């Protein structure tokens, strides 16, 4: 069983906030609700399903992403070690504005595909975590 | 070690700007067949990158080249913020890959698909 | 850890009773669509048995219930008792697998292209 | 050559008793007869056709199972270690009527196949022994 | 141990003459089907031929019967007088197999395509 | 160059003598003839049209056999080592006469293709040997 | 760049000299000109193209064969180190005229392709060396 | 040990000349089909040559005559005066093989697809 305005399905609970926020915050919040809990991870297409269409029924009309637990987890600006001609990529001068180390949901495709995107971005997002029984 | 008529020369390097509008791919294997260790230009140092800017500037109309790094997202090491890997996926299909500017020595990217010119380079 | 909706739990089990009537290896494959480690039920202890005989007296009309062992006599080590092992070979080819009642910790057997209900079972 | 009422096949002696008796005692009795003796064993579809051909003209019209000396050796109730989901069968409550560890031939089928059978069920049963020269 | 009804015994052994005349391949493969380890008789004693002697002189109408040995010119090792080894070959295809007689214990030879009459052997 | 009757074929010479010899006598009053002289050998199909060709030309009409050099080195009767049940060949009761240890060469096939023969016939024979230079 | 009457082709300098010599004098004639240069090397069909038009466009008419770089390293009057009975050829008498160890260009074949040819002959040659920068 | 007829005898070889007209290859194929050990002649001394030639110019009306070397020039080591090995290569496709002369000991060449007389040798 779950919190008020929280949704129950397979083993865990999820819930859409409203709440703008970048992935770091959205991630530390997402903790703060309860023991396990993270930003939403889709495991399958079952859950991808699921998880779409909670975000239909409760994401507000003007709001239109939705973050998601997928993250880069490389340090450098961007993941290419080698340039074309088998150089290293040791010198990188990516604008950090092109840098799109997160990844989110969106309206236009019904929530269902996993865009790339940047992690300054302050959008809505869905938690994640399993009940205890 | 000389550069060949038409190339331009920094360094021990020889670069070529193209101004055909070719996609990611077509640029650097068309940069293959122009020369012998030929490539889309990769930069090591801001003094190559403002040598080829400015010479770029001065040849193309449009804004933005091709540069030698293709699929910068697709090599990336995903992992969920729950610790888990990324097992099922349901991406989608996207291919970013390195562009210069014309006017600035910051570089972007822009789908592997789209169509700029480009820069060739090659060693000796 | 919680099970599923519409499911029962045990121990730290999760079991759920299915009326469609299908064959042993219909019902495996059928439990195995049902959710990650699902399978038929496999009991290890008397106090589960209990269980999903109660469970499943209260939603089963019929009394025969499939569980998850299979070929019960095929895997046996047959032997002459002359001393000899059964080289030659002219069985009558059978397949027994097991059945639970609903109203009893007692198991039967019965063939596996026989038809009758059943409950699957997985961990987490 | 073999004694009376014994049929003499290939190099053995075979006959059927019409007794009813339990594989075990069935077993024991004709170890009883002679050297050697035991249920019979068929070996070969030519001692399979004999035994069937003799079984017909011998038997009882009121019986119609024959024992034979196949028997599983498993100690265990049935012979499936494992459960569908890989876990050991270590709990069994497998009822004794449904033990089926031994064999017989039926008059049903010409008394050809073999079927599984308990081994508490008293019927007729065929003995045989290799005789000396 | 005895010996299936129609077949005489020696030895440790189990002998049938049969009339059927068959070639030496044939025949050998017949004994085959017969029993179990039958094949064409093989002698190790002079008593043992004088035993199927008398028991084949006593049924069979001919005089020759087939014996286990075939092909006998064809595995020796043939040499030039002059030492060296006949790598080049233009031999007449022949190939002799062994027969007994049936009024004496020496052997002869005949084509293994020939057709006489024979017995079988084996064990237990 | 050669003897006289004898012919030289390749680097060889060759001659049938029409005296009836058992291979072993044959044999040795070839060596008697030279250096190196054998019973023929034929090593070679154009050897063996030479050969017969020869041997056509001069053998006595009333002869239709000659011995060549091919032998057995076998010591035993025959050179069947086993039987058809895998029982070793111990025992061999074959008859001298039918011993065919030796080989020819007969008119009946233009003196070509090569026959077993009793080493114990006595007919004509060629022999050969290598003339220096 | 390069010197007065030079061709400059990719990276390289090219020239052809009207003056009849032989393999080794043209050789050391390119070596004089200038470091690095030697009798012009042709390693790709773009080069090859290149030199033929050069070589077309600044022989004299009454010239036709042009000398490069390519020349038999090995000893021996001939490069056959076997004869087809597969013994060694170690006695050789071929004749100096018929060893032609060099190679050249000719104006039959609009110079492209390459001919093998006497070392002692005098013709004009092509010279190539890398300018500096 | 002595030649066959129509075969002259040097030291302890065997040769033999044909004034059929062949291709280098095909000379050699039929110098293999004459004999066992047989092939284009090859030399090893002067007097060998001397030999073949006293006895080819009393034969041959030709003046040249194929030897048993090939493709001389192909399995050579070539190298660009500039150090580098051939990668590239653009040769004029040529066959070269040896020609002895009749009327003197000093050899030539000729295209291997041209045709000449020959000799064949073997040992024993």
């Given at each position: ?7 129950y ?12 926020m ?9 903790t ?48 290419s070690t ?5 150089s ?22 019904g ?11 302050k ?11 | 070690?000389?550069c060949?008529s ?15 509008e ?9 940069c293959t ?10 930069f ?35 992992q ?8 099922y ?11 210069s ?5 910051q ?7 789209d169509?700029?010119?480009f ?5 000796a």
């Amino acid at each position: 069983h779950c919190p008020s305005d929280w949704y129950y399905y397979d083993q865990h609970c999820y819930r859409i906030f409203n709440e703008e926020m970048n992935w770091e915050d959205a991630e530390w919040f997402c903790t703060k609700q309860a023991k396990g809990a993270h930003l939403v991870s889709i495991k399958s297409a079952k859950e991808a399903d699921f998880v779409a269409w909670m975000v239909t029924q409760n994401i507000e009309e003007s709001f239109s992403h939705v973050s998601i637990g997928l993250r880069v987890q490389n340090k450098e600006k961007q993941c290419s070690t080698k340039w074309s001609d088998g150089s290293s990529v040791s010198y990188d001068n990516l604008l950090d504005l092109y840098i799109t180390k997160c990844s989110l949901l969106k309206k236009e495709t019904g929530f269902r595909k996993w865009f790339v995107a940047s992690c300054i971005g302050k959008i809505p997002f869905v938690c994640k975590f399993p009940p205890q029984c | 070690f000389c550069c060949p008529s038409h190339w331009s020369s920094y360094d021990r390097y020889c670069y070529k700007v193209f101004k055909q509008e070719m996609t990611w791919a077509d640029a650097e294997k068309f940069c293959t067949q122009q020369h012998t260790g030929s490539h889309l230009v990769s930069f090591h140092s801001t003094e190559e990158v403002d040598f080829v800017v400015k010479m770029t500037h001065q040849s193309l109309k449009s804004t933005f080249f091709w540069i030698g790094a293709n699929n910068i997202w697709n090599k990336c090491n995903w992992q969920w913020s729950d610790g888990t890997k990324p097992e099922y996926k349901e991406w989608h299909e996207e291919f970013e890959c390195l562009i210069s500017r014309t006017f600035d020595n910051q570089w972007l990217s822009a789908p592997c698909s789209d169509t700029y010119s480009f820069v060739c380079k090659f060693e000796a």
